[PDB]
Amino acid sequence: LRPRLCTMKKGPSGYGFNLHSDKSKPGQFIRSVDPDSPAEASGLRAQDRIVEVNGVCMEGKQHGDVVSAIRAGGDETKLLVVDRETSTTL
């Protein structure tokens, strides 16, 4: 599965997701997505990692800097996200 774009327009309750850091892995991940939210409708899923915000790479950025990038876009955001890697050599 490859990176997917989730495009959403903000409602009165925001987009409807929680963004958080991981214990082990770098990057900002989707903790949860609210039912019936703009976020859910856009295809965003729990455990997704944010790769880009509005076409800008988020690699190496701290949590607050990804949050600011999302907020800076005003009433809309476009998140390029990927699910967690599921490939292991044994």
From Swiss-Prot:
Main location: cytoplasm
Superkingdom of origin organism: Eukaryota
Phenotype when changing R4Q: In NPHLOP2; the mutant expressed in cultured renal cells increases the generation of cAMP by PTH and inhibits phosphate transport
Domain PDZ: 5-85
GO BP: actin cytoskeleton organization; adenylate cyclase-activating dopamine receptor signaling pathway; auditory receptor cell stereocilium organization; bile acid secretion; cerebrospinal fluid circulation; cilium organization; establishment of epithelial cell apical/basal polarity; establishment of Golgi localization
Subcellular locations according to the entry: Cytoplasm; Apical cell membrane; Endomembrane system; Cell projection, Filopodium
Modification Phosphoserine occurs at: S13
PTM: Phosphorylated on serine residues.
Function: Scaffold protein that connects plasma membrane proteins with members of the ezrin/moesin/radixin family and thereby helps to link them to the actin cytoskeleton and to regulate their surface expression. Necessary for recycling of internalized ADRB2. Was first known to play a role in the regulation of the activity and subcellular location of SLC9A3. Necessary for cAMP-mediated phosphorylation and inhibition of SLC9A3. May enhance Wnt signaling. May participate in HTR4 targeting to microvilli. Involved in the regulation of phosphate reabsorption in the renal proximal tubules.
Subunit structure: Homodimer, and heterodimer with NHERF2. Binds the N-termini of EZR, RDX and MSN. Binds the C-termini of PDGFRA, PDGFRB, ADRB2, NOS2 and CFTR. Binds ARHGAP17, EPI64, RACK1, OPRK1, GNAQ, CTNNB1 and PLCB3. Binds PDZK1. Interacts with CLCN3. Binds the C-terminus of PAG1. In resting T-cells, part of a PAG1-NHERF1-MSN complex which is disrupted upon TCR activation. Forms a complex with CFTR and SLC4A7. Forms a complex with SLC4A7 and ATP6V1B1. Interacts with TRPC4 (via the PDZ-binding domain). Directly interacts with HTR4.
Identification of the protein by name: Na(+)/H(+) exchange regulatory cofactor NHE-RF1
